[model samples]
Target chain A: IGTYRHVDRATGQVLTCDKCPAGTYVSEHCTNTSLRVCSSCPVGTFTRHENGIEKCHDCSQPCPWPMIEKLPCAALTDRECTCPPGMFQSNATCAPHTVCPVGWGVRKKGTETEDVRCKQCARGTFSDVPSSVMKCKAYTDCLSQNLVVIKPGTKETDNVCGTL
Target chain B: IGTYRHVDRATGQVLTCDKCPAGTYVSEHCTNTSLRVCSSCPVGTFTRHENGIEKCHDCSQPCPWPMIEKLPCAALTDRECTCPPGMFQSNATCAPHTVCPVGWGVRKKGTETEDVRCKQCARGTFSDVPSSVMKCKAYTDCLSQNLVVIKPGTKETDNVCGTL
Candidate 1:
């Protein structure tokens, strides 16, 4: 959808010329009697739209570790990238998932875009170790095993059992 | 280093024209009787070399955390980035320095481009904890302390000294 004009030096007349399409560049400008010459983009280069420029642009750089390639570069589009699993995009880079500490439990697992959500262990539930994926566990029922409860469970420790 | 062509519609003649320089764009096409008009590139956009395109390219993206900026974006150049201290460029991102495990010790400290080098502790030396910057420590000299050696040193434990 673009055009330019050239002079027919000998005839002293102006001639309208068409521009090159996307993925190509103008190899030779139009002459008084001929249309412009277009050339395909070379490797590692691209042109996203119709243009009359002389050079194509360099393809986008590759994504780094903890980041995965979503789409590769092409003659008309740049490469795309996204954070990997168990990591979330924090600004321009991917960060490791958050690990819940002792006395706390994982409320939700982390995804490629969201961090792990942690919550405090409520009564009857106990989390004795740090984790990023496991939730708080329930206290054991001593009566079911015909045993007596020797100690109550706490957020940071499990209940203790004893024989009668 | 570039040029374009224009037509004098009234006179039915063509004329050669100069192109806009880097950091600028052509505001108006040239006519057979007048030269092309140029405009400065706006913020967040640039033209690294002489060009005849209608739109300026967007500035380079910012560096992510752990990646420090070596150069900022300018009207004619893109931003540059490098890994930070105690981290190294691992493919596309920066990684933390490696910590030497127990029984091992750091042979050399890590730099922005290289990981820490670790070596196993030899006889007469001991390393009891994991570390990224510390080297193997020499065992206690019992004779210098005017005491007897209760226990000899090992790679994982220090020598024990007792009164004479």
Candidate 2:
């Protein structure tokens, strides 16, 4: 048998030539270990049932719904879809909308569909006791019943009512 | 030779019965010091003439104006009167009729003929500002030209004319 020498293209180590195992492509030869290293398909792409193949097969539908496009899946875990407007994916899925409590109103900002809280109505202006959307009613009469009247529009002042 | 026994009938003391000093009365007496133990007239009562007596004269006429009749006085100090209704005592004497602050009214309580303090008006009503007597306004409008709608019965809920 004739002697033949093989050199690893990456590390430059010398070895005997041997065909790489199936599902792997030989980039170089190594004396200590095989030069061929196995690599899987990237995210948004897929590999079908195949063996002894040099490369993985691309998915039939490359980019699925919600998923943007193919990207390098070098790690074990990676994101499939990027969040869209009006939606937020805190963990693996998007969160739902938030609602305000009674006697309060709400506004929103950014991609979050949830609303922010607002201040309550002042005294002497009666809103439907405990509701957010109710209209406010103003007082009309103060005297003749021997009642004391507090001036309106005073800050933090209530519409005072008492006997003579 | 015979011994004479002395007995005081008023005090039941064997020694002596002493008379009250001039211009004073015996308000109280003690077993010892019969001659020196006579008490003088207390406040709210008086004695005009000097007499060897046990009691002083009470005031002829009860304190007339603003004076509340409680305990009978033995001297001037015990004679006291309150300010009459709607009146205040600026000095030792009471003034005629006193009024309450603006937006407030007065009421008499207990045996008091005069108002102690002013009471506040009720919501949706108001009185003339800063007047001792809270004169209820005919209409529910602020006196100031810049102020509009007076909140019913309230002391200060008047809306400014051009405000939103």
Candidate 3:
């Protein structure tokens, strides 16, 4: 199944032979005297498919800062970097994490590859501080705590409680 | 500096009104009795520049898989993701790392946005195994080891030594 046609340099004879496999390249073309010669891909080089290419392609270059190596380069595959949490490709740089503001809370926490999602505090929930990880807090229940309510809570403010 | 033209609904008169700052929107239009009413940008929305618009823009959408958000969306900015160490933007996808093979060594380690670099092992150094992070090793000295040379080392092998 893996075959390629080549013209013999010495005799101008066209011949067919087994092609090189992934992670390797054709070291020498097939000749009437012998079969095709294959060689392993050198360090920092690779070949993903079977072919008669003379040279393997160079591997990927070093990753920029804030980005780290996830997988090193291999003969058959390229290197991989981590899509770390709270960062994403923004133009050419990693975008920093977002901080939710007061009156808003995290709707979805940030992950290795996605930014945090925020939500507005509804009537029953409130957030008096800015944060990237916290959700809107439920309003205080004075009666549940056996305390009297001195003031009601707003989206940006906490409820004030008084001792019974 | 932050102003826009608006036609007052009550009087049908074109009025010069102060525009709302970033992170807010014009909740109420300018009027004869009151200036433009500005309100904070709601959750999952943003306004980067001063504007007289009635609504804020929606935050950036969730990043795709294998890619992460670096920053969360906010009133003033959008969500972001991490550009981890070994990956880089390769046509909307992160590029994997490159690995070095036998007879060669890593010249440089891969980073978040780039791949590893490899170098051929020199005459004095040898690398008998494949790796992505390791470099060629110097040949052992038979005399220093207080042993006789059994077989000289090659670029891909360590020197064999034997007891005197």
Compared with the true structure, all predictions reach lDDT values of: 0.72, 0.39, 0.73
Interface RMSDs of all predictions?
22.8, 58.6, 24.4
lDDT of 3 by residue, B1-164 (tens): 37899999878999887777665678887675345666666667767677889998998777777766433454555555544444556666777666678889888877545678889998878999887668999988888989988988887899898874
Let me know the DockQ for model 3: 0.01
Q: Which of the two, 2 or 3, has more TM-score?
A: 3
Worst 10 residues of 1 chain B by lDDT: B69-78
- Candidate 1 Cα deviation (angstroms), residue A82: 52
Top candidate when judged by lDDT against the true structure: 3
Give me the runs in candidate 1 sitting further than 4 Å from their true place.
Answer: A1-164, B6-14, B99-164
RMSD of each: 34.6, 56.1, 23.5
Which should have the higher TM-score, number 1 or number 2?
1
Q: Write the per-residue lDDT of candidate 3 for residues A1-164, one digit (tens) a residue.
A: 28888888889988887687665678887675455666656667767677788998997887678675443454455555654445655656678668899999998887546788899988878998998778999988888988888888899987888874
TM-score of 1: 0.31
lDDT of 2 by residue, B21-91 (tens): 32234443323322223333443354433333456666556666654432223221233344433355565
- When only the first chain is scored, the TM-scores of the models are 0.55, 0.22, 0.64
Worst 10 residues of 2 chain A by lDDT: A69-78
Q: State candidate 1's DockQ.
A: 0.01
User: Which candidate tops TM-score?
Assistant: 3
Over A1-164, each residue of candidate 2 has an lDDT whose tens digit, in order, gives 12235665676777554333212222333344322222333333323222223444443432334433112111111222333333444555555323333333333332322323334444554333443223344443466546767554222223566654
